[model samples]
Target: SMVRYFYDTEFIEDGHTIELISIGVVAEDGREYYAVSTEFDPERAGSWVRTHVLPKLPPPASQLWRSRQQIRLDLEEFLRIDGTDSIELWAWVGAYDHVALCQLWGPMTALPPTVPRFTRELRQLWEDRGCPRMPPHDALVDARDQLRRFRLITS
Candidate 1:
């Protein structure tokens, strides 16, 4: 059997690179994962991220804030479960978010055997069905929204 995981990542982008801010994932079985990266420099983020994304982050002291390496380990464990034969990853307009997810382990080639190399794009599904507005700067909220939209569209 296969399990579908819908996920999202919030990031800061310069002309050349994307820096992960936070990531969220929701599994079809209702398990959820969320983490804010303590590794990225907030000062490097652009004004839009400062206004929209940064405000949604938990306080620095919050347990939700984790180093990228920690997030990677936790997320890997979250995705690797018993009795799972396959995993399907999904994200909305996910090219950049997929990159951020892959970068967690290093390069795409470095990802663990259990982790998928590509994410299925929900935006294409949404557009194919007819655009329906959903929702966010907050990674978890956005991930949940994607899962909700997926059910609505596919149902």
Candidate 2:
């Protein structure tokens, strides 16, 4: 019913040195309707977390672990017709998410995290058609900018 999806999670590389500042998603109404942002868990984060990502985002916290691909699969299933038909996913620089999803599917040999028509739509759509000035990585601002750009239909 609700064709919505969020596309991000905190990536604490080097134990937390360069952790992701935000977790995000953009609903598939061809615009930015919903984007969620949650700070990375500081305890799970490594030493340099503050240097690379923290300054660019809200302060960190100590939330429990939330598996990245668990949410990914849930969203994929939303588009699935019969737990088999693939989905034409839209993500901004989806390489990270795609890779993570593949790893997440390491166990489910049947499903295999299908991205049949998967497309990286950040530059082509949001920046090209929408006239956006920034990249879609920071979560909230990106989402808001995307929403603003959504009004640019050029009729």
Candidate 3:
């Protein structure tokens, strides 16, 4: 059977590049994955990132702060489970977030071969559902909100 993974990412834009601050995913299997970057510097980011995303970041010494490479490794293991035949990545207005995911291996073209090439946008779903409340910027919280809508839609 196919696996559907709802994902979200909080990021900061610098120059022409967007960098990941945090990412979270909830799959149809009920497994969750969250990772925060050790490289995020609040001072260099926009005020929104500072106010919303930065406050949610763990302290530097916490185990939650992982490098991109570490996150990639974890994601690989997460996806390598027993019977995952195919995967779909879902997100709301996810163009840049998808780009960040691809950038994990360095250049924009460095996406891992296993990652799904496109993201299924949930914006239309949210709008069609009468626009339920969404948590502003916390990746984990927002993902939970999306998953709630997803379950409602499928049920």
Candidate 4:
């Protein structure tokens, strides 16, 4: 059987620093499923906060921050799974997030976003199915939507 993968990322800013709140995953077998969630490494993230992150953070503690490299690694490891599988990265309005991911993982691991390995503007799938949606930013909910949407396409 083939496997389907779904991922979502969020930001947590502290003054000038931003932490990738968590990366969520859900794997499925026909009607059955399994899921997991992991938070980013704060220490490594702290570095980004000091340099690029803190500057990005909104002034008066309202700045937007970024999660460090460790968060990307943890997320990548979650993706580097075993057996036959397909990956689908789902992010709302993905341009920034996609570029962010590329910088975070591509240079370090020698893998940049390429054809058939990335998901930005996932409207192509939904444009056919009546566009059923679950919610925004709720990682698991969006992941489920992605799985169900894909099932609608292939099954």
Candidate 5:
């Protein structure tokens, strides 16, 4: 048996680079992980993030902000439970989010060995199944939708 998860990310362009504002993951078994970064500039995060993602972020006073490195470490732990090693990851239209996930570890080559190098996209599956565009921009919610379509595809 393999451990499967769906992950999502929200980011903004920072001049020549992109900075992650939020990251989320949901396992098939209902385990969930979300992280927001305090390192990004509110101004630089762009309007989409401000309007769609930022408001959903836990207040800074809530102490939910975490470093990208720590978030990746937490993700590793989340996937490695029960001494499990085999893991798979997916997302919905995940190209950009996949890039962001690699950046979490520094570089594509530097990705942790346990985490899958790429995320499978469920966009096609979603479309095939008549998925709706409900409640956008929330990483966890979007990822959960991806997980839903994935199960539909396999079932």
Candidate 6:
């Protein structure tokens, strides 16, 4: 059986490059993972991100602040991407989210064999099902809502 993982990513993009700020993933089984990148430069964040996304970030003292490397390892473990069970990744309007996720370890070519190369687009599914909306600024909340909506539509 395929295990679905709904995920979301917050990032700073300048039309050329995407700098990941945070990522969240929710497995079908109810396991969840969330992390904020220590590697991202807050000063480089656009005004919108600074005003909107930054305020939603966990407090600096929280354990959620992690290096990209740590986040990658945790994600691999959380998703159980061991080249055994089938895994499917989903995200809302996820082109940039997938890019940010792939860049976690380096270039797209560096992605592990066990990890899915593409993320299924939740936005497409949402639109197809008549556009039910939840809410988001926090990646974890976004991911969770994606899972909620998935169950709502597919059921």
Candidate 3 achieves a global lDDT of 0.79
The full ranking of all candidates by lDDT, starting with the best, is 6, 1, 3, 5, 4, 2
Candidate 4: residue 120 lDDT (0-100):
43
**Any runs in candidate 5 off by more than 4 Å, and if so which?**
81-84, 126-136
Which residue pairs clash within candidate 3? Answer: none
* CA RMSD per model (angstroms): 1.9, 6.3, 2.8, 9.3, 3.0, 1.8
The list of candidate 4 runs beyond 4 A from truth reads 1-3, 12-19, 28-70, 81-92, 106-109, 112-117, 129-136, 153-155
Local lDDT at 155 for model 3: 56
lDDT per residue (tens digit) for residues 40-145 in model 6: 8999998999999999998999999998889999988988878588889999789999999999878888988878889999879888888765544999998999
Which lDDT values do the candidates have, in the order given? 0.89, 0.45, 0.79, 0.46, 0.78, 0.90
Clash list (residue pairs), candidate 6: none
Candidate 2: tens digits of C-alpha lDDT, residues 19-111:
343444455554332212343465765566556545565333533223444444454544453555435544456555544434434533534
Better of 3 and 4 by lDDT: 3
Using lDDT as the measure, the top candidate is 6
Model 6, CA-based lDDT: 0.90
Model 5, position 137, has a per-residue lDDT of 74
Off by over 4 Å in 1: 81-83, 130-136
The TM-score obtained by model 4 is 0.46
**Candidate 3 lDDT, 1-155, residue by residue in tens:** 67888888998887688878999888878888889988766678888777877887778788888988899878777765434467788987888888887777666455556567788888877788787665447787777777877877655
- The TM-score ranking, best first, is 6, 1, 3, 5, 4, 2
- Tell me the spans in candidate 6 whose CA falls farther than 4 Å from its real position: 130-136
